[PDB]
DNA sequence: GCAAAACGTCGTGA
DNA sequence: GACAGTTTCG
DNA sequence: CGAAACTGTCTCAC
DNA sequence: GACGTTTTGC
């Protein structure tokens, strides 16, 4: 469970709320028991004329990975554990994404308790609706009142 | 000069790479003896919906100003003296315009003398390409190859 | 059924 | 993000 | 003459 | 920046 350097943390706080995404998604998915898959992801975006910044990002955070879509690239945290571990130590830094941080921890640690219940799973998708509303968001589709498409 | 708090250098240089610019230019002005004003410019940009984080900024940093244009906000710092003493501070927290922040700070402690001699604003306006060529420049007109034109 | 990965771009917010 | 044009004022 | 603010916008990099 | 839609394999 690794433990990041301060300082670390303090500037990569402020690339975060400058050029990153704390993201909550719910992802149709049929293979899922309610049809639905909650998906989190911490990311942060840069020209790939960068990207050497995102590789470093791999080091020093010690798990994700970058992708390459063309003129961008983005380094990307997806893994539930990990996740927890790294946005509880970045959080109390951050002063945009600060709120949609606390969310995701929020989230993560509901998540066995919603894949239990079609109430607990519909409450956490509330929360995802909030971290939505939080950001810029401008393509978003499915909701927790999508979801609600479980009365059946 | 300001001292400025180490954490808050940390963080503002990470939110600096991210959606900060340090800028140099040159001009075209007919008041001045060369035709070009060497202009400096430290900014963030950022959406005006969060304007606060832009005002607050001025209050942490003690000088500039916000300035607004439309749908997005600009903090910008372009007073020379306080200009050197902020980037003098942040500068060794950069990652992504540490190079640029030195060019400035390196103009800047030239242009009492690039005031006199017409080769030594060139030699300046060298310092200028080298900033330009650092950062995602796109729309830039006037370049040390345009002051050139001080040949007569 | 599910934890992540992999791939696709839209609408800006730089 | 990163400049470029116009105006103000000691 | 010039530092510095007021004002406007290309092309994305987010 | 912040999604969407589909595919991977214990
Ligand atoms: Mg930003
Ligand atoms: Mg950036
Ligand atoms: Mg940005």
Redesign the pocket.
Known sequence: NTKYNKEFLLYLAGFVD????????????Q????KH???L?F?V???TQ?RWFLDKLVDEIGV??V?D????S?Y??????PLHNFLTQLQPFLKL?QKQANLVLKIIEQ?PSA?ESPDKFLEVCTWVDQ??AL?????????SETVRAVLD
Chains 1, 2 share one sequence.
Request: charged share 30%; hydrophobic share 25%.
């Open positions: 400058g050029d990153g995404s704390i993201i909550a998604q719910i992802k149709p998915n293979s899922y028991k309610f898959q909650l998906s992801t990311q975006t840069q020209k960068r994700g990975y992708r879509r063309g003129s961008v983005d990307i945290l997806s893994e539930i554990k994404k998540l894949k971290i939505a950001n810029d968001s401008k393509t978003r589709k499915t909701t």
